[PDB]
Amino acid sequence: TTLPSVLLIGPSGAGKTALLTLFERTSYKVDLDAAGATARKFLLIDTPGHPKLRGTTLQHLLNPSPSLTIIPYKSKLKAVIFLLDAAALADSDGDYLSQTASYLYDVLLSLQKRFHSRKNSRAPSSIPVLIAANKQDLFTAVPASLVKSRLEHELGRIRKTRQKGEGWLGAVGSKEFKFEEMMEFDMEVEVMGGNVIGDGPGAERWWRWIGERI
Ligand SMILES: Nc1nc2c(ncn2[C@@H]2O[C@H](COP(=O)(O)OP(=O)(O)O)[C@@H](O)[C@H]2O)c(=O)[nH]1
């Protein structure tokens, strides 16, 4: 067994490869020898963003006690970073918002189903989720507080449309979706801005948030 794992999840173009590169400077090929993994005491596990390949990642999130197979060999999953392009989110057609929120919906619903799976009465270990709103260096980037409200409204729209036509994300009696409501399933979900390149807040706040929780 190695250091614990953090799954890095998100649509293509979000900056996952770039983030992993910054961090360093089925089964997963991971450089254990990387200075970033030794100094922070966790492994950052890049996953594919292509829609056809998301099922594999979601399967880890359903498991009451997920361990990742790591090829430099079992690592405990302790957190998720969901990375998105905060600039692409600002597009007028709303396409990126919709497709990104759809993925996030599945990620959170998977962790919710995990919480609810009780082959024995005991609650599973917590897996917090950092929604990392990347590319804040760009002038067109949506700020984290707006990323939060836009995502919440879209996740709300999805659950309402699906119920009209478990599939329901969040609390049964919730009338307006909020990430905070996921604490009913001991799921801490927070939206935080940052950037991997360019001038801005950088990535350290993301690393701190994860570090305090694993
Ligand atoms: N402006 C800006 N561009 C970024 C940032 N992070 C990544 N990128 C760029 O976004 C593109 C997609 O990044 P990549 O790591 O390949 O994304 P991936 O598909 O999620 O693995 C690349 O051109 C990166 O250089 C950022 O914080 N700001």
Q: What's the rounded Cα separation, in Å, for the pair 55 and 35?
A: 30
Instruction: Report the first-to-last Cα separation within the chain, whole angstroms.
Output: 16
Q: What's the rounded Cα separation, in Å, for the pair 127 and 66?
A: 10
CA of 138 to the centre of ligand 1 (A): 11
Q: What's the rounded Cα separation, in Å, for the pair 34 and 24?
A: 5
13 in contact with ligand 1, CB cutoff 6 A: yes
CA of 24 to the centre of ligand 1 (A): 16
132 in contact with ligand 1, CB cutoff 6 A: no
Helix (H, G, I), strand (E, B) or coil at 68: strand
Decide: residue 205, CB within 10 A, 0-12 exposed, 13-18 middle, 19+ buried: middle
Q: What's the rounded Cα separation, in Å, for the pair 95 and 151?
A: 13
Per DSSP, 123 falls in state: P
Tokens for 157, please give them: 């729209």
Tokens for 158, please give them: 């999805």
Q: What's the rounded Cα separation, in Å, for the pair 16 and 196?
A: 9
User: Nearest CA to 157 among 90, 83, 101, 85?
Assistant: 101
47 in contact with ligand 1, CB cutoff 6 A: no
CA of 56 to the centre of ligand 1 (A): 23
167 in contact with ligand 1, CB cutoff 6 A: no
Question: Which domains are assigned to the chain?
Answer: 1-214 (3.40.50.300)
Q: Is 193 annotated as a binding residue?
A: no
Q: Is 194 annotated as a binding residue?
A: no
- The 10 Å CB-count burial string (b at 16+, else e) for 155-174 is bbebbeeeeeeeeebbeeee
CA 183 to each of CA 85, 111, 126, 197: distance values in angstroms, whole numbers, following the listed order? 25, 12, 10, 32
Phi-psi region of 149 (alpha: psi -120 to 50; beta: other; left: phi over 0): alpha
195 in contact with ligand 1, CB cutoff 6 A: yes
Per DSSP, 111 falls in state: H
User: Nearest CA to 64 among 6, 112, 1?
Assistant: 112
